[PDB]
Amino acid sequence: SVTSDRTYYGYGDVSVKNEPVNVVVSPFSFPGANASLSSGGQGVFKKPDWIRVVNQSDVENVKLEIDWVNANQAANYFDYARILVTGPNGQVKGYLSLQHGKAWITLDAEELREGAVLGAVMYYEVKEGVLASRLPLVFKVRVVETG
């Protein structure tokens, strides 16, 4: 007697909670301790553990764009400064300077699955006679493409 409207349903939900990556920063105070940086000096500064990239259990491929924003200010203080981002396990995937300001370090399934540390190695020459204190160095980490 009834003419059934023949429609039954099924459903499900998808939970996207976190962002793919956590860029834990441990900043560097490069004149260091028990050391000394003088005006006009030239040298190298090394920090083994600077940016730790922590991924979630699914993320396997990450493309990071590292960018130096205040480089035009440090141009008035340094004469050459070369930052090498000591990548995952000995590889060096990034190089920033006062002129070439963008890096594109990319990590894949082997480098993430062991804990990705990005140290810094800085080659510096202080412009002649410049005396400063607690100069800032700020790098923008953009996650451009993850998978």
Closest Cα partner for 58 from 18, 11, 87? 18
* Whether the Cβ atoms of residue 117 and residue 23 lie closer than 8 Å to each other: no
Least Å distance, CB 96 to a second copy, is: 11
Contact pattern for a second copy over residues 97 through 136, marking x by CB under 8 A: ---x---x-x-xxx---------xx-xxxx-xxxxxxxxx
Q: Residue 124: helix, strand or coil by DSSP?
A: strand
Which positions from 75 through 104 interact with a second copy, judged by CB under 8 A?
Answer: 77, 80, 82, 84, 89-95, 100, 104
Least Å distance, CB 5 to Ca ion, is: 16
Q: Closer to a second copy at the Cβ: 9 or 33?
A: 9
Strands (E), 87-136: 92-97, 102-103, 106-107, 116-126
Site membership for Ca ion, residue 1 (CB under 5 A): yes
CA dist 85 and 139 (Å) reads: 12
Q: Closer to a second copy at the Cβ: 63 or 101?
A: 63
CA dist 96 and 71 (Å) reads: 10
List residues binding Ca ion (CB under 5 A): 1, 19, 58, 108, 147
